[PDB]
Amino acid sequence: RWAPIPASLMENSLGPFPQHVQQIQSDAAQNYTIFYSISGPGVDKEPFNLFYIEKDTGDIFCTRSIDREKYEQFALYGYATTADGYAPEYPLPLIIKIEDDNDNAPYFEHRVTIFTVPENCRSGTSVGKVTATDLDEPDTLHTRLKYKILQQIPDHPKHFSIHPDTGVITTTTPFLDREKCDTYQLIMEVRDMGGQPFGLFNTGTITISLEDENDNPPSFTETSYVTEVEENRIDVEILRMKVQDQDLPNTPHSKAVYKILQGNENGNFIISTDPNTNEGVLCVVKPLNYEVNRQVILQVGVINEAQFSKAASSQTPTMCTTTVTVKIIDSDEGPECHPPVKVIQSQDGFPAGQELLGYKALDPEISSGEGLRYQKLGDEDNWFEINQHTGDLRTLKVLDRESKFVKNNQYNISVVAVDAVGRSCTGTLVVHLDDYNDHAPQIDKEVTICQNNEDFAVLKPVDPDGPENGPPFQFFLDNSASKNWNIEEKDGKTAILRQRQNLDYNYYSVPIQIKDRHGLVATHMLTVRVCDCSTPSEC
Amino acid sequence: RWAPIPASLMENSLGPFPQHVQQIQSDAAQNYTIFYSISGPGVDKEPFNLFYIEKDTGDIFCTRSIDREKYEQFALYGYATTADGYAPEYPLPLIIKIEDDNDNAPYFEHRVTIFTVPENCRSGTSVGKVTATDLDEPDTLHTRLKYKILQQIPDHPKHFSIHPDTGVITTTTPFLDREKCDTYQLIMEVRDMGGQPFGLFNTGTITISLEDENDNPPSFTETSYVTEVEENRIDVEILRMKVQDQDLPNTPHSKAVYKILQGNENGNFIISTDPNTNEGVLCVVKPLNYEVNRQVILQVGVINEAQFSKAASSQTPTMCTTTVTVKIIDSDEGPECHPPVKVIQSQDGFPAGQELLGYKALDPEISSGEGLRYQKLGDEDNWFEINQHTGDLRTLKVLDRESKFVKNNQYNISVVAVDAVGRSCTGTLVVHLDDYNDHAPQIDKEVTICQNNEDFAVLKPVDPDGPENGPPFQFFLDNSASKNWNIEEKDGKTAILRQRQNLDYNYYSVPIQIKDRHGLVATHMLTVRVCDCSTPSEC
Ligand SMILES: *[C@@H]1O[C@H](CO)[C@@H](O[C@@H]2O[C@H](CO)[C@@H](O[C@@H]3O[C@H](CO)[C@@H](O)[C@H](O)[C@@H]3O)[C@H](O)[C@H]2NC(C)=O)[C@H](O)[C@H]1NC(C)=O
Ligand SMILES: *[C@@H]1O[C@H](CO)[C@@H](O)[C@H](O)[C@H]1NC(C)=O
Ligand SMILES: *[C@H]1O[C@H](CO)[C@@H](O)[C@H](O)[C@@H]1O
Ligand SMILES: *[C@H]1O[C@H](CO)[C@@H](O)[C@H](O)[C@@H]1O
Ligand SMILES: *[C@H]1O[C@H](CO)[C@@H](O)[C@H](O)[C@@H]1O
Ligand SMILES: *[C@H]1O[C@H](CO)[C@@H](O)[C@H](O)[C@@H]1O
Ligand SMILES: *[C@H]1O[C@H](CO)[C@@H](O)[C@H](O)[C@@H]1O
Ligand SMILES: *[C@H]1O[C@H](CO)[C@@H](O)[C@H](O)[C@@H]1O
Ligand SMILES: *[C@H]1O[C@H](CO)[C@@H](O)[C@H](O)[C@@H]1O
Ligand SMILES: *[C@H]1O[C@H](CO)[C@@H](O)[C@H](O)[C@@H]1O
Ligand SMILES: *[C@H]1O[C@H](CO)[C@@H](O)[C@H](O)[C@@H]1O
Ligand SMILES: [Ca+2]
Ligand SMILES: [Ca+2]
Ligand SMILES: [Ca+2]
Ligand SMILES: [Ca+2]
Ligand SMILES: [Ca+2]
Ligand SMILES: [Ca+2]
Ligand SMILES: [Ca+2]
Ligand SMILES: [Ca+2]
Ligand SMILES: [Ca+2]
Ligand SMILES: [Ca+2]
Ligand SMILES: [Ca+2]
Ligand SMILES: [Ca+2]
Ligand SMILES: [Ca+2]
Ligand SMILES: [Ca+2]
Ligand SMILES: [Ca+2]
Ligand SMILES: [Ca+2]
Ligand SMILES: [Ca+2]
Ligand SMILES: [Ca+2]
Ligand SMILES: [Ca+2]
Ligand SMILES: [Ca+2]
Ligand SMILES: [Ca+2]
Ligand SMILES: [Ca+2]
Ligand SMILES: [Ca+2]
Ligand SMILES: [Ca+2]
Secondary structure: OEOOOOEEEEOOOOOOOOEEEEEOOEHHHOOOOOEEEEEOOOOOOOOOOOEEEOOOOOEEEEOOOOOOOOOOEEEEEEEEEOOOOOOOOOOEEEEEEEEOOOOOOOEEOOOEEEEEEEOOOOOOOEEEEOOEEOOOOOOOOOOOOEEEEEEEEOOOOOOEEEOOOOOEEEEOOOOOOOOOOOEEEEEEEEEOHHHOOOOOEEEEEEEEEEEOOOOOOOEEOOOOEEEEEEOOOOOEEEEEEOEEOOOOOOOOOOOEEEEEEEOOOOOOEEEEEOOOOOOEEEEEOOOOOOOOOOEEEEEEEEEEOOOOOOOOOOOOOOOOEEEEEEEEEOOOOOOEOOOOEEEEEEEOOOOOOOEEOOOOOEOOOOOOOOOOOOOEOOOOOOOEEEOOOOOOEEEOOOOOOOOOOOEOOEEEEEEOOEOOOOOEOOEEEEEEEEOOOOOOOEOOOOOEEOOOOOOEEEEOOEOOOOOOOOOOOEEEEOOOOOOOEEEEOOOOOOEEEEEOOOOOOOEEEEEEEEEOOOOOEEEEEEEEEEOOOOOOOOO | OEOOOOEEEEOOOOOOOOEEEEEOOEHHHOOOOOEEEEEOEOOOEOOOOOEEEOOOOOEEEEOOOOOOOOOOEEEEEEEEEOOOOOOOOOOEEEEEEEEOOOOOOOEEOOOEEEEEEEOOOOOOOEEEEOOEEOOOOOOOOOOOOEEEEEEEEOOOOOOEEEOOOOOEEEEOOOOOOOOOOOEEEEEEEEEOHHHOOOOOEEEEEEEEEEEOOOOOOOEEOOOOEEEEEEOOOOOEEEEEEOEEOOOOOOOOOOOEEEEEEEOOOOOOEEEEEOOOOOOEEEEEOOOOOOOOOOEEEEEEEEEEOOOOOOOOOOOOOOOOEEEEEEEEEOOOOOOEOOOOEEEEEEEOOOOOOOEEEOOOOEOOOOOOOOOOOOOEOOOOOOOEEEOOOOOEEEEOOOOOOOOOOOOOOOOEEEEOOEOOOOOEOOEEEEEEEEOOOOOOOEOOOOOOEOOOOOOOOEOOOEOOOOOOOOOOOEEEEOOOOOOOEEEEOOOOOOOEEEEOOOOOOOEEEEEEEEEOOOOOEEEEEEEEEEOOOOOOOOO
16 A cells, blocks of 8 residues: 555644645546545544535535644545445545644743853863753754853853854853852853744753862961960960961861971970861970070961862962961079989098089079089988088098998988079989908808717808909918818818817817908907707707 | 545745655555655656655655746656565556746736727727736636736826726727827736735736727818809819818718709709819709809708718718809800791781781890891792891782692791891791682583483582582582483582483583582583493593
């Protein structure tokens, strides 16, 4: 079957109705009469009675106006029957095609649309795309939409340009900046018919608001800073420096972050950020001493939580920094005494009535150290006497390491220094005595031996001198015990009193001399007890 | 077969070519491949390659612009065959109908055309009809013509009016006159599109020339005429009168015809029309006699060869006529003599030397008959002698009816009258004389009779007088022969000489008297001889 050739009706005909469409006719109309009849969606179906046919002339007619956008075409059947109801001709499948006119204006899905763009973006940066629906016959001039910007606000300079065919808005300058203007509005138009002035149209708004980029570093209020704090302070804020950021406030592009760049090596200072005011609070956390440093110079800088961009302040070093000089003020302190211990050395044979360098107390204000009233405290055998105005020492006794108040060969005396108000230090003074051979080997003199269980005694000398000036000892007999006693010296620190087999139960006496390593003699009278004991207790 | 549904093309398509017309498609295409092809006057016939079909898509296209006025529609055949040569479809009869736009202006067949009408016609008289060719599609606005006169010249009054739809020119007044205006021009316009101002148009001329009708009778130059001709003249023109006709000259409406209305009863005059000058020649054909009438007065009229019309001077009495007075002149004539014979009566016994009224000779100039010199000619026995002046008779001899110069009782004598110049007539005078009884019956005297074969004779008298003064006669005897002779009168002119038986052979003498009807006696002596003869000569 061949496709039917379509007759065409223009939508929105006003009249006069009934309006004429086409004329169907059959050649078999000769010889005998024929009754023309019609049927299809449009006559005996929905929509009803849109068409009808003159029973004789075969002329088709139209009873009402048609909206192409509701009905695009009608597929009908043409008939040729006769009064008797005979049917010479098969039915004619015809179609009536509804043609389109520009009876619809293109409109915008939404009155006002938003787009957003990052500031400082490249020109030709495409920002977005608009689309308008036009219900006319598609892919025809009646539907060919053309876009263009009707007006921009602020009016100049124009930063936007829309491609008329696609509807893409794009940028025209690279100089978009949120800090100069944060939002632009464009009034738009859609004209069908290819944009020719007899086209149908509507307008709409399209607001463009810029998204912020951190293209501005923060900057301090004043060009440079100065302040004051007292020495030996802690947990106190020195100053508050405020800052300016030209970007979006209360955001990582706005919030500041300070850093002490140079000057804070020891850790004396710390800086932090008041979160409610975004200023930098400078505090003292470890104390300063006026005497060591009178002036500290800090260089503090500021940065944003989030990073910098735009490539004008990014390649180049643009953290803005100011130099804050913190002055420390003087407090007149009591006296200090470091190290907590001084030490001086001397010979053990050091004479009395001598002057010796004692504890030096350094006054912090003036290094001369005068104006102080020293004072001894912990002196046992009173070896010393202090100079009240210079803290020097005067020997009273002859010094002597072998004193029963000499542990480790040292003597302890503590001194209290006092200033002209009531403040006081304390120092400890160690007296390290070097040794001299001023003693000789000493021993006990009450010897004791049993009879049938010992033929000897063991006698043990002790040189109170130092290990260098002590043993090895040398033991001599006096010949008072000529050939009734004898002594032998195996080691250099022990000796054994060998009696001879000529003994009585009595108290004999044997004089014995003993020598130190150098040759200092002592003489010792031993009273030996000769008991018939067993153990060294039964006597 | 159902009639094909036509797809439509606008003539004068600008483009863009190739342009899409319609799309042929076959249902049997889902089964196996089909290659579409078309053919008809428009593809492989004339005009060639205007159309073509995409073999697969079935779209028909058009390659060039079409002039509907060259080709009103194209009847094509669409074919759907396959590579294998199968043919699902019989060929599809298509027709591509070319639509018309108003691209032709209606024009006039001839720049200037002529029509003609007779003058003095009724208003609404149809003069002619114009037709313009417009090659556009008939029965549409593109050809719906409206006609109109743009200008008529002479400008006023407008005598013509054209019907805007049909193109028939008509008259508007009845006052058309060729003698006032012979020709009109109409400047015309034809506007298609129903004469609406955006219609196409052209102009033309239409000359109207009036046909002449005889609406003017001819009229004489002079108000009246006078002239002179000679008495007793023949075959000569008396005068030439010219005439005026304001109609079409040298035509049956101009050429004249004269007729004598009154005055020419006897037939003296005849008039005719000179064909070379159209004037009237008045002639004499029977002669005039000055003495009878000195002046004749004629009534002449003139009319046109062709009859009069318009029914204002044709229905109404308008033959113009003039009175011609023709003067007759006197001619000095010879003498005339009518009747050519006179007759006069008299007694036969009329005396000599007597005067009698004779022949009258009429001189025409003066009726006195004087100035005339008469003269006798034919008088035999000289009965008369004529008077030379006037026409009298003088008896010379005594008159006598029984004269031997008188036949039938009349006497002829001719007289010639002569005037004082030399002209002469001739006349005869018959003299019928009355009878008198002056003679008596006379007879011979020589009788003849025989004896034995005759007893009587026969004698016959003759009275020279008239039958009235003659017989019947009466015969008397003198009684000289007492009883020897006797006569009897049977008839009125008979006589028989009866002798008696007492007779002897001798020569007797018998007196016989005889009288006429009235009683005049004569005596005659007969010498009668009676011999014994036999025949009428031998004695
Ligand atoms: C006389 O005064 C001096 C003052 O220093 C005493 O000598 C000091 O002895 C102390 C205790 O032995 C030493 O203290 C240190 O202690 C830590 C742990 O507590 C240990 O790790 C160290 O090795 C050291 O022993 C101190 O260094 C030492 N000072 C000096 C200058 O020698 C001395 O003991 C005093 N005399 C008497 C009789 O107490
Ligand atoms: C219809 O009538 C015509 C008369 O000219 C005739 O030729 C034709 O055959 C008729 N129709 C049929 C189907 O025979
Ligand atoms: C520019 O950018 C917008 C959003 O990225 C697009 O919609 C447009 O087509 C062009 O790429
Ligand atoms: C675009 O402009 C028209 C002006 O004709 C407005 O009516 C419309 O609302 C939109 O602003
Ligand atoms: C688009 O929307 C704006 C409001 O944002 C209107 O002012 C404008 O006329 C258009 O309707
Ligand atoms: C300084 O320091 C000592 C302890 O080392 C105290 O005993 C003295 O009284 C002073 O306060
Ligand atoms: C009037 O009559 C003329 C003939 O005199 C026609 O030619 C014209 O068409 C109209 O009928
Ligand atoms: C009819 O009249 C017009 C005047 O507009 C002429 O131009 C034309 O030639 C025709 O004579
Ligand atoms: C008819 O003819 C005359 C000239 O004879 C033109 O003047 C007129 O315009 C029309 O062509
Ligand atoms: C009168 O006279 C003429 C001559 O003058 C004759 O010819 C005529 O016959 C008549 O006698
Ligand atoms: C009488 O007779 C004569 C001749 O005698 C004629 O000549 C004349 O005319 C008249 O008749
Ligand atoms: Ca619609
Ligand atoms: Ca549209
Ligand atoms: Ca539409
Ligand atoms: Ca920026
Ligand atoms: Ca920014
Ligand atoms: Ca910032
Ligand atoms: Ca200090
Ligand atoms: Ca200080
Ligand atoms: Ca101080
Ligand atoms: Ca010592
Ligand atoms: Ca020692
Ligand atoms: Ca020693
Ligand atoms: Ca054309
Ligand atoms: Ca046309
Ligand atoms: Ca036209
Ligand atoms: Ca006239
Ligand atoms: Ca005339
Ligand atoms: Ca005339
Ligand atoms: Ca005369
Ligand atoms: Ca005369
Ligand atoms: Ca005369
Ligand atoms: Ca006589
Ligand atoms: Ca007589
Ligand atoms: Ca007589």
